[PDB]
């Protein structure tokens, strides 16, 4: 036995293309649409819960994931690749930051760590690139609210608003017309729901849509009282009912 694939499986072609990264992006293009919008007092990330079967319980499959109390993530592309990246991202936030500085990492640095893991799968021996693009939304004291996109190559860019996957080209055009620097969080959620409706074919409701926000501190979700400086997580996943309430004012 032994892993005898110690050489790179991603290499430059004569034209200067890294084939495996390009093909990974093609896989992301086939994936279900997800988006992110940044407001003045928060950030929203959203996607469609494309259920593989009606017998399947789609609540047990989480496309939007908490990474830290103030950072969340959504994807487009290969689901299993995303799941393991969320596991690695959660752990690296602790091992390379919280166990050193006694606090959670800022959004940009956690994104940086996730990017590094994705870059290494593009150069290390005997592995293929991750077939996902991530959208990571978060808040921290000194940088405020932010939204980042991470690609299979490991490259990452900050956005005011964006979309990835199936209908990203049309969705990004829709967001350009609606986005301004004076948006409140509720306005951004409204725009997110409008944008997402265009790329969805079938049912459009709280049970087929997954949506989360990075907003105000939630002391009700902290689990304990007595420490004034601990005020609770800024990440909150909206319920099925909360989504449907905002679909009536749509």
């Amino acid at each position: 036995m032994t892993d005898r694939y110690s050489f790179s499986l991603t290499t430059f072609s004569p034209s200067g293309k890294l084939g495996q990264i390009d093909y990974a992006l093609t896989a992301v293009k086939q994936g279900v649409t997800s988006l992110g919008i940044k407001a003045t007092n928060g950030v929203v990330i959203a996607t469609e819960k494309k259920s593989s079967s009606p017998l399947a319980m789609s609540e047990t499959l989480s496309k939007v994931s908490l990474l830290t109390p103030d950072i969340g993530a959504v994807y487009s592309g290969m689901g299993p690749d995303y799941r393991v990246l969320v596991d690695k991202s959660r752990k690296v936030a602790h091992t390379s930051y919280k166990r050193i500085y006694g606090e959670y990492p800022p959004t940009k640095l956690l994104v940086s760590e996730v990017a590094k893991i994705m870059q290494e799968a593009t150069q290390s021996g005997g592995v293929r690139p991750f077939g996902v693009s991530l959208l990571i939304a978060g808040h921290d004291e000194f940088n405020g609210f932010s939204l980042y996109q991470v690609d299979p190559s490991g490259s990452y860019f900050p956005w005011k608003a964006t979309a990835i996957g199936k209908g990203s080209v049309a969705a990004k055009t829709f967001l350009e017309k609606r986005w301004n620097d004076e948006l409140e969080l509720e306005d951004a959620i409204h725009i997110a729901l409008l944008t997402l409706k265009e790329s969805v074919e079938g049912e459009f409701n709280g049970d087929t849509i997954e949506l989360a926000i990075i907003g105000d501190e939630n002391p009700d979700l902290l689990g304990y009282t007595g420490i004034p400086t601990d005020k609770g997580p800024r990440f909150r996943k909206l319920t099925s009912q909360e989504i449907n309430d905002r679909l009536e004012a749509l």
Binding site: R4, Y5, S6, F7, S8, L9, T10, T11, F12, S13, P14, S15, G16, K17, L18, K38, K108, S112, A115, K116, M118, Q119, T122, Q123, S124, G125, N143, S146, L147, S153, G154, S155, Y156, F157, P158, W159, K160, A161, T162, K172, L175, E176, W179
Partner: protein
């Protein structure tokens, strides 16, 4: 077994060229142009962001210009993710040197170390090379202001003015024409922006499509200051030089 699937990234062609290095350089030629100009009283680093969007958050964005320490900075051309791996290694090397000798690392020693790392990936390990070219702008008390470049082969050279990325042939000709030895920083700022303005593939050169930085002894008395330009500050220098 596994041999079947091995691309053999570290071999010579019949002509004596390294396939992967050559192809990596082809990749870099499609990256946004980065220019470095060295003057008597400082160094300028100018670079073009690649076809951006109106929804990109520019003021918190960094894809071209990176700080290695207080005295040395780099402009990037190629895969950004590959560059960040090397940049972090270089930052650590500078700190190792400072801890060992209690003196800031000389610019060339840092450049040689990174270039040697790139070289290793072309000779052993069977991995693909880093698809990155750097322009190093730095200062030390031995040679003063210095400009270097390194590419995926691991070869590095010193320059008075240099470009990497897209349209380097056209850019280098324009720099070779207008550069003089007694030039000053404010003149070099103008030359860098004028060169990018003519070589760009975009319709017009605007503040949102640029990253800019200077290394000056324009710091109060015998010391050096690094200035990574803000979006509004790039907008002002574009009006001052008469491009917008």
């Amino acid at each position: 077994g596994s041999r079947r699937y091995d691309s053999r990234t570290t071999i010579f062609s019949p002509e004596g060229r390294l396939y992967q290095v050559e192809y990596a350089l082809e990749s870099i030629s499609h990256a946004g142009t980065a220019i470095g100009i060295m003057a008597s009283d400082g160094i300028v680093l100018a670079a073009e962001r690649k076809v951006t969007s109106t929804l990109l958050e520019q003021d918190t964005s960094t894809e071209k210009l990176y700080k290695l320490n207080d005295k040395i900075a780099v402009a990037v051309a190629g895969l950004t993710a590959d560059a960040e791996i090397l940049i972090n290694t270089a930052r650590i090397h500078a700190q190792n040197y400072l801890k060992t000798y209690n003196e800031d690392i000389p610019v060339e020693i840092l450049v040689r170390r990174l270039s040697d790392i790139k070289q290793g990936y072309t000779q052993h390990g069977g991995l693909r090379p880093f698809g990155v070219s750097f322009i190093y702008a730095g200062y030390d008390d031995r040679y003063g202001y210095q400009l270097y470049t390194s590419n995926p082969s691991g070869n590095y050279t010193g320059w008075k003015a240099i470009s990497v990325g897209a349209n380097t042939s056209a850019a280098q000709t324009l720099l070779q024409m207008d550069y003089k030895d007694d030039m000053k920083v404010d003149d070099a700022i103008e030359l860098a922006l004028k060169t990018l303005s003519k070589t760009t593939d975009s319709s017009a050169l605007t503040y949102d499509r640029l990253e800019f930085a200077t290394i000056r002894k324009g710091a109060n008395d015998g010391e050096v200051y690094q200035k990574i330009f803000k979006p509004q500050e790039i907008k002002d220098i574009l009006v001052k030089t008469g491009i917008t």
